[PDB]
Amino acid sequence: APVRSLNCTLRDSQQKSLVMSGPYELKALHLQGQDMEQQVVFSMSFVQGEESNDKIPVALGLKEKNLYLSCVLKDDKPTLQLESVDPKNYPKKKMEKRFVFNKIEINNKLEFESAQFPNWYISTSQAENMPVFLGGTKGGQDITDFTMQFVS
Numbered sequence: 001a002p003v004r005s006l007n008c009t010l011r012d013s014q015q016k017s018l019v020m021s022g023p024y025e026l027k028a029l030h031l032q033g034q035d036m037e038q039q040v041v042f043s044m045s046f047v048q049g050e051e052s053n054d055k056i057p058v059a060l061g062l063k064e065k066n067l068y069l070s071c072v073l074k075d076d077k078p079t080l081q082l083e084s085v086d087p088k089n090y091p092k093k094k095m096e097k098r099f100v101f102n103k104i105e106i107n108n109k110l111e112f113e114s115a116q117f118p119n120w121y122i123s124t125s126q127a128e129n130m131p132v133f134l135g136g137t138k139g140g141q142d143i144t145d146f147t148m149q150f151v152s
């Protein structure tokens with residue numbers, strides 16, 4: 001059958017919202033009121049992959065855009081990028097591994113681990129208006145926990 005998808009927003013555990021501000025540039029900042037329209041709406045697809053009660057493989061596309069978060073090596077490091085795809089062919093149930101995140105539920109928060117790069121996570125900085133990135137530890141000063149808001 002098709003792939004199943006939900007519209008949603010994400011906020012980091014310091015309640016920073018995610019926005020587009022540059023061509024392929026997703027950023028995290030404190031947002032409230034009128035400016036909350038600026039936040040990115042995701043289409044979260046439930047994709048093929050290894051699954052358990054609290055670890056669910058997803059892809060994160062931008063709503064009604066042929067753009068997906070992906071994990072690739074850049075200048076020899078696991079990095080987060082926005083990648084364009086053929087809009088005729090996406091989303092699909094069997095997403096390529098660079099597109100797959102394990103959505104992990106721990107203590108009423110979510111983490112998004114790269115399926116491609118184990119123990120690398122979607123991360124934000126504590127500072128305002130810095131890139132969303134792939135961080136190689138769910139420890140330290142960087143933020144690896146999120147909440148999801150379901151959107152119409």
Ligand SMILES: NC(=O)c1ccc(NC(=O)[C@@H]2CCCO2)cc1
Nearest residue numbers: 024025026080081082131132133
């Ligand atoms: N110097 C640049 O032209 C440039 C800098 C940063 C970005 N993107 C990111 O850092 C991505 C955004 C999705 C996750 O991380 C894109 C372009």
